[PDB]
Design a protein around this nucleic acid. Structure first.
Ligand SMILES: [Cl-]
Ligand SMILES: [Cl-]
Ligand SMILES: [Cl-]
Ligand SMILES: [Cl-]
Ligand SMILES: [K+]
Ligand SMILES: [Mg+2]
Ligand SMILES: [Mg+2]
Ligand SMILES: [Mg+2]
Ligand SMILES: [Mg+2]
Ligand SMILES: [Mg+2]
Ligand SMILES: [Mg+2]
Ligand SMILES: [Mg+2]
Ligand SMILES: [Mg+2]
Ligand SMILES: [Mg+2]
Ligand SMILES: [Mg+2]
Ligand SMILES: [Mg+2]
Ligand SMILES: [Mg+2]
Ligand code: NA
Ligand code: NA
Ligand code: NA
Ligand code: NA
Ligand code: NA
Ligand code: NA
Ligand code: NA
Ligand code: NA
Ligand code: NA
Ligand code: NA
Ligand code: NA
Ligand code: NA
Ligand code: NA
Lengths: 145, 92, 194
RNA sequence: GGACUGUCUAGUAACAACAUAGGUGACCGCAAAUCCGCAAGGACUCGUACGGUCACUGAAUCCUGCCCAGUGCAGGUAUCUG
RNA sequence: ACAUCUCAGUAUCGGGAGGAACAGAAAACGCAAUGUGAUGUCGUUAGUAACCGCGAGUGAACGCGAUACAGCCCAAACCGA
C-alpha cells in the first residue's frame, strides 16, 4: 500500500492547512523566480566568468594509465612479446575521433615494457624506465618544440 | 587631508623599499568599440530598449581614494585600496 | 564575338549614364500616365528576358507593373500594445516590391502563370518591373520542351505560393549551408523564424 | 437664481445645470485656416472675410480697474547653444 | 511589480496549390582533411555552441546511425528560317 493510496479521507493530502496548495505563490514564484532575493540561498552567484575557445580549435586527447596496461599484459597475448612491447594506439578505446594518445603514470609497473605512444608524462616515463623499459614517441609525437 | 607627493614604501615589482610618486588616476577615453558598445546598437529599436533605456545612477557623499603609486627607479605603478576622503591635496 | 544582346545588358548596368539615361527620362513620362498593369508587345530589356525564359512565341506575355516606393502603409494600433508593438513609421513588409508587382500582374491575367520578372527602373516615388507570363493552355507552349513544365497542376497559382524566382530568394533559400537552418525546406515548417 | 420659448440624467436628480440671441478674442486670401484616411482619396464647399473655422462669456441697462515676474502663445535676435 | 525579454511568430485575419505539399543536384561542408558529396524526414549530436534587465528564460548546426535514393534543362558562344 502506497502513501498515495492512503489519502482518501484526509481532506488535505499532506499539505497542512487547505489554504496552502494554491498557485505559484506557495512556490514563491514560477520556476527560478527570486534566485537573488527571497530564494538566493544555495544558488550559484550572479555573474560572468571566463571565456571559451572555438570548438574547432579544441583538442580531445585519449588517456590511459600505466596500471591499466600493466594489469592486462599477460592477457593481451594478441600483442608483441619482445625480450613486452605494445603500440598503445591499438589498446585505447575512442582512439578514432581523438587528436592523439597519451600515457599517464598512475600505478605500478611490475614489467619491462616497451611503449609506443604520441605523448608521455614524467611519471609515465620514470615508471617505465624504472622497470628497465623504454618509451617510444611516435611520428606524431615529434610535435614537441 | 594632506599627502606627501613623494615618499618611501614597498615596491611589489622591485621587491624592496623605494621612493614612490603619487598621482591621481585620470580617466582613460573610451574607444567605443567594446562588446557592450555593439550590443547597444544591436538591441535598440522600436519602443523601450531594456537596460539601454536607463539613465546614470547617483552619488555617495564621499568617494574613496583613487591613486597610482609610481616607483622612482623601475618606473612601474601599483594600485592600493582607497579610503573615504572629502578632499586630497599633495605636498610639494 | 560579343552578342548584340550583350550591349543591351551593358547599358543597363548604368541606367543613369549614356543614351539609356536620356531614354529613361523620356519613357517614364509616358509610364507615369499609364496604368498599374500594362501589357506590352516587346520586353524593354531583351537580354534579361530571354535569360529568364522569354521566347518570341504564341502564349508568352509581358506586362509592366508600377508599385509605390517605400515602407509599409500601416495603420496605428487601436487597442492595448506594449511599446515594442506601437510602431508605424519604421515597419516594412517582409515581401519585396518586385514580388508585389508579380502578384498584381498575375491577378490581371487569371489564366496565365508567372515565369519571372526584372526591374526597368524607378523615379522618386515608384518602381517599375516587367513580369513574364505564360498561357498554360495554349498548345504552342504545351509542346515546348523548355516551357511545358509550367503546365502541370502543381504549378497552378505558383506566384502566390512563393515558387517564383524572386519568391524563392526573398524566402531566404539562396544559401545551401550556413544561415539557412530556419528557411529550408520552408518558412512555415520552421515555425516562421526568418 | 436663471433674462425669456427651448434642452437633460429611457429606469430615484427637470434644477440655479445645458442651449439661446447678444458681447468678445483667435486663425485663415482659398493650392487658405480647421478636420477625416494606411493609401487611393474625402467633409467644410453648388461656400470666399457681410465668409467659416476654433474658443470664452451668456438678453437688456450701467460698467468692466492694476500686474507680462512665473506658465502659455507669438515676434526678433549681435552673441552663446544647437 | 514591470518597459527589453517571455507567452509566440502562438490565437486570429488575407491569398493559394495537391493527393500529399514545400525542398532539391553546391558561388556546399570546414570531425582542416591524402576528407564528405542533391533534398526531405526519423534517431542522435544536445539543453552542447550561441542569445539574454548576462535575470527569468531562450536555443541551433557540422558530423554520425537510419529511411529512401536520380539526376537533368536553358541564356550565350558558333549556326541563322
Ligand atoms: Cl574553451
Ligand atoms: Cl583621489
Ligand atoms: Cl501564377
Ligand atoms: Cl564530412
Ligand atoms: K507583454
Ligand atoms: Mg528605442
Ligand atoms: Mg516538410
Ligand atoms: Mg430658465
Ligand atoms: Mg431619472
Ligand atoms: Mg421642469
Ligand atoms: Mg423626474
Ligand atoms: Mg448657464
Ligand atoms: Mg457669443
Ligand atoms: Mg459671436
Ligand atoms: Mg522564440
Ligand atoms: Mg527580477
Ligand atoms: Mg555547420
Ligand atoms: Na507533506
Ligand atoms: Na489543500
Ligand atoms: Na521557489
Ligand atoms: Na539580493
Ligand atoms: Na567520425
Ligand atoms: Na541583431
Ligand atoms: Na494568374
Ligand atoms: Na530571422
Ligand atoms: Na412655449
Ligand atoms: Na507674466
Ligand atoms: Na509672459
Ligand atoms: Na500588475
Ligand atoms: Na533581454
Amino acid at each position: 500500500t502506497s502513501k498515495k493510496k492512503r489519502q482518501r479521507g484526509s481532506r488535505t493530502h499532506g499539505g497542512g492547512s487547505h489554504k496552502n496548495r494554491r498557485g505559484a505563490g506557495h512556490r514563491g514564484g514560477r520556476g527560478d523566480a527570486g534566485r537573488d532575493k527571497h530564494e538566493f540561498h544555495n544558488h550559484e552567484p550572479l555573474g560572468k566568468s571566463g571565456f571559451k575557445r572555438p570548438q574547432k580549435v579544441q583538442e580531445e586527447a585519449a588517456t590511459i594509465d600505466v596500471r591499466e596496461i600493466d594489469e592486462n599484459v599477460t592477457l593481451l597475448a594478441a600483442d608483441d612479446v619482445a625480450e613486452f612491447r605494445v603500440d598503445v594506439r591499438d589498446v585505447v578505446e575512442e582512439a578514432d575521433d581523438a587528436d592523439y594518445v597519451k600515457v599517464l603514470g598512475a600505478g605500478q609497473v611490475r614489467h619491462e615494457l616497451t611503449l609506443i605512444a604520441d605523448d608521455f608524462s614524467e611519471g609515465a616515463r620514470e615508471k617505465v624506465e624504472g622497470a628497465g623499459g623504454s618509451v617510444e614517441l611516435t611520428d606524431l609525437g615529434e610535435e614537441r618544440q | 587631508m594632506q599627502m606627501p607627493r613623494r615618499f618611501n614604501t614597498y615596491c611589489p615589482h622591485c621587491n624592496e623599499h623605494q621612493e614612490h610618486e603619487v598621482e591621481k588616476v585620470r580617466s582613460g577615453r573610451q574607444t567605443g568599440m567594446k562588446w557592450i558598445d555593439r550590443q547597444r546598437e544591436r538591441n535598440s529599436g522600436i519602443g523601450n530598449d531594456g537596460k539601454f533605456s536607463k539613465v546614470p545612477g547617483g552619488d555617495k557623499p564621499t568617494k574613496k581614494t583613487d591613486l597610482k603609486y609610481r616607483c622612482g627607479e623601475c618606473g612601474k605603478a601599483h594600485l592600493r585600496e582607497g579610503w573615504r576622503a572629502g578632499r586630497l591635496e599633495f605636498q610639494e | 564575338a560579343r552578342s548584340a544582346y550583350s550591349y543591351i545588358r551593358d547599358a543597363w548596368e548604368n541606367p543613369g549614364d549614356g543614351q539609356l539615361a536620356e531614354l529613361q527620362w523620356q519613357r517614364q513620362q509616358e509610364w507615369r500616365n499609364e496604368g498599374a498593369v500594362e501589357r506590352i508587345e516587346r520586353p524593354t530589356r531583351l537580354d534579361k528576358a530571354r535569360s529568364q525564359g522569354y521566347k518570341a512565341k504564341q502564349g508568352v506575355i509581358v506586362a509592366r507593373v508600377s508599385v509605390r516606393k517605400g515602407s509599409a502603409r500601416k495603420r496605428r494600433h487601436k487597442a492595448g500594445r506594449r511599446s515594442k508593438r506601437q510602431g508605424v513609421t519604421r515597419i516594412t513588409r517582409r515581401k519585396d516590391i518586385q514580388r508585389v508587382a508579380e502578384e498584381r500582374a498575375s491577378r490581371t491575367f487569371p489564366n496565365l502563370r508567372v515565369l519571372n520578372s526584372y526591374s526597368v527602373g524607378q523615379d522618386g516615388r515608384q518602381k517599375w518591373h516587367e513580369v513574364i507570363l505564360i498561357d498554360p493552355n495554349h498548345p504552342a507552349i504545351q509542346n515546348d520542351d523548355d516551357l511545358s513544365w509550367i503546365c502541370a497542376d502543381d504549378q497552378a497559382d505558383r506566384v502566390f505560393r512563393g515558387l517564383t524566382g524572386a519568391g524563392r530568394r526573398n524566402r531566404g533559400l539562396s544559401g545551401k549551408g550556413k544561415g539557412s537552418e530556419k528557411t529550408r525546406p520552408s518558412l512555415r515548417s520552421n515555425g516562421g523564424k526568418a
